Each structure stands twice: as C-alpha cells, then as structure tokens.
Amino acid sequence: TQMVLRAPKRTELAKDGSYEKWMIEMEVGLRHRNPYASGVLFTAAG
Amino acid sequence: DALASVDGNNAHVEGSRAEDGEMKPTVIKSNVTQILRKVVRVSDTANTTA
C-alpha cells in the first residue's frame, strides 16, 4: 500500500517579477502487511 | 510633486521581480514673512501751527 499524506493541490509561490512560479509537492510512504509474504530474487554469481 | 518623469527608453521583461526600482520624494518650499515699519516724526513746535 501507498500511504499518502499531502494529496497535491493548487499550490502557488512568490513572484518577485512578472513570472508565476508554481510547485507540486507530495509525501508518500510504502507499507507491506507482512515482510515474509512476497519474495525477491537477486541475480549474481557464486 | 517633483514627478521626475524622465522616460527615455522603457522595455522590460519578466526577469524575476526586478528589485532596483526608483522613487522620488516630495520636495518642500518654505518662504518667510517680512516686517514693515514706517515711523513718524512731529514736534509740537509745528503741530499746532495752522
């Protein structure tokens, strides 16, 4: 699962001129119910 | 007012909120007031003579 915290919205910032600076933030985290549920292989020698 | 509206050539861009700018204050003008004085000199030796 992906724990989301910020939910990007209409964010604006300063101008200090004729331009219009904009940004988009996001705070996200991973969640796994049980580590021993899934599995991974790693390619290598030996 | 001291508008100081020297224009020359003005062609700007959106270069991040130009900060230099410029500003003129209001200049002051203050005069003075003079005191007038006119004296009179008369003696009784001639003030009574018609």
**In this complex, how many residue pairs, one in chain A and one in chain B, have their CB atoms less than 8 Å apart?**
18
Q: Which of residues 1-20 of B touch A (CB under 8 A)?
A: 12-19
Q: Using DSSP, state whether B1 is helix, strand or coil.
A: coil
Residue closest to A18 by CA, chosen among B20, B17, B12: B17
Token digits of residue A6: 């910020």
Please report where in the chains the tokens 């290598």 appear, as a residue. Answer: A44
> Residue A29 and residue A23: Cα distance in Å, rounded?
20
Mark out the alpha helices in A1-46 (DSSP H runs). none
Chain B neighbors of A17, CB-CB under 8 A:
14-18
> Residue A28 and residue A5: Cα distance in Å, rounded?
6
Q: Using DSSP, state whether B45 is helix, strand or coil.
A: helix
Mark out the alpha helices in B1-50 (DSSP H runs). 44-47
> Residue A18 and residue B12: Cα distance in Å, rounded?
10
Q: How far is CA A23 from CA A9, A15, B16, B19, B24, in A?
A: 9, 12, 16, 23, 37
